[PDB]
Amino acid sequence: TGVSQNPRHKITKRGQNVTFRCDPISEHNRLYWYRQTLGQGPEFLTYFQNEAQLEKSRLLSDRFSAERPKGSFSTLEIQRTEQGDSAMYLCASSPDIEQYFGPGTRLTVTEDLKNVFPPEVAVFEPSEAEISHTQKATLVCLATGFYPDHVELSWWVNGKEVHSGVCTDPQPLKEQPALNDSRYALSSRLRVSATFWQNPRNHFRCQVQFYGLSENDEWTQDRAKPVTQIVSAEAWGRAD
Amino acid sequence: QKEVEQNSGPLSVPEGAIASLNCTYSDRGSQSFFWYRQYSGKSPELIMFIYSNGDKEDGRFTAQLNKASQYVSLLIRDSQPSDSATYLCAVNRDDKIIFGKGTRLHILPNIQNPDPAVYQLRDSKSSDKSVCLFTDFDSQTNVSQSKDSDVYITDKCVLDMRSMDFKSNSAVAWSNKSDFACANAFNNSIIPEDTFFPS
């Protein structure tokens, strides 16, 4: 339960249309759309009461189009997408004035679907010097060369996901900061005791869920179509 | 918008201490105010609201609304690791909530026994790819980003070995070069003088 939004991610070539959908909490007469970019607050777009769209902001330009036909779900259409439309599109519903937000739709508008790339993933094994110095072992995952910057990195030890001893970078950093469609990189650490790492039956996977092209996206290259996909890399423990 | 003003920080607050977040508003007709918490990958979550002048406590949070001075505040007692997030100030303007740009809060871990050290790590797959790991430094060590387009450096990141009740910071650097050694990797940053560099 809660407010739901779909899709969770959208890549679009600039100049194309795109439509997002919100499914609010059923009891709420009020629906809101907001746009948000990193380091900034949610910027107000429009506001529905039942089916009536009662308020629009100047950020809801002509190319923007929101409707809530049955005073229920809502759709937001951006026509002829620009790079400056890249943002997270948030939906919220209210019984009065408190706002409850959905998980968002992350939109990336790229010049050309050809600049979409899946991550490459590599796992780096604990240093022998750390093992001797601290009796602990830090694995490092690197995810590199992905665009756009919507990935989800997780660690899996013996087939199960672990959270303890994990640190992942809060944001992926740009590989070509002076390029508008720069590929990205992400790193994560996983720290276990030295003895857990020296066990050769322990299996360590770094998994990166990447959100890429849709099945109905036009692919015109010979390198594999960078669809939504998991890339992962692995390492087994070693007894000194 | 120009009706919700808050400084972007980031604010760094020692674990256990009180974190203080402030926000000012331009319109004295405003009556209803909110604090929203947003974790880095996530949507804003409402944690406190206040609709009259005065104080409000709910657990570790204290929200304060002062109409005469036109500010609203959030106090977080006994700062935890889990409070590290962006905290959005918000005011109701008729029937729509308007948000400030958000203040980012870093709750610094209390590192019992720092043991700063730079280790080099090598790929599980081709053992010619490597990575530098700066770890176990205290929480007021500032990692400086690269102004070298061939060198990638990540910021500080705290992990919790919750079973062993041990927290630790670390930062990672790598390079398109592989003759690149970890001695000169973090040198664009000020690091502890006795950082261990093994051979």
Residue numbers in the entry:
A (entry chain B): 2 to 241
B (entry chain A): 1 to 199
Task: Quote the study that presented this structure, word for word.
Here we report crystal structures of one public and one private TCR (YLQ7 and RLQ3, respectively) from COVID-19 CPs in complex with HLA-A*02:01 and two S protein epitopes, corresponding to residues 269–277 (YLQPRTFLL; designated YLQ) and 1000–1008 (RLQSLQTYV; designated RLQ), that were found to elicit almost universal CD8+ T cell responses in HLA-A2*02:01+ CPs but not in healthy donors. Public TCRs are observed in multiple unrelated individuals, whereas private TCRs are distinct between individuals. For its part, the RLQ epitope, unlike YLQ, is conserved across human and zoonotic sarbecoviruses and is therefore a potential candidate for inclusion in a pan-sarbecovirus vaccine. The YLQ epitope has been identified as immunodominant in multiple independent studies, including one involving the BNT162b2 mRNA vaccine.
To assess ligand-induced conformational changes in the TCRs, we determined the structures of RLQ3 and YLQ7 in the unbound form to 1.88 and 2.35 Å resolution, respectively. Superposition of the VαVβ domains of unbound YLQ7 onto those in complex with YLQ–HLA-A2 revealed that conformational adjustments in CDR loops were restricted mainly to shifts in side-chain orientation that serve to maximize interactions with pMHC. Surprisingly, the Cα domain of bound YLQ7 showed a large deviation from the Cα domain of unbound YLQ7, as well as from all previously reported Cα structures. Cα residues 157–165, which are in unambiguous electron density in both free and bound TCR structures, adopt markedly different main-chain conformations, with r.m.s.d. in α-carbon positions of 6.0 Å. Cα Met161 showed the largest individual displacement (10.6 Å in its α-carbon position). In bound YLQ7, β-strand D ends prematurely at Cα Leu159 compared to unbound YLQ7. As a result, the β-hairpin formed by strands D and E in a typical Cα domain is disrupted and residues 157–165 assume a loop configuration. Whether this structural rearrangement is a consequence of YLQ–HLA-A2 binding or simply reflects a degree of malleability in Cα is unclear (see Discussion). By contrast, the natural pairing of YLQ7 α and β chains was independently confirmed in another study using single-cell sequencing.
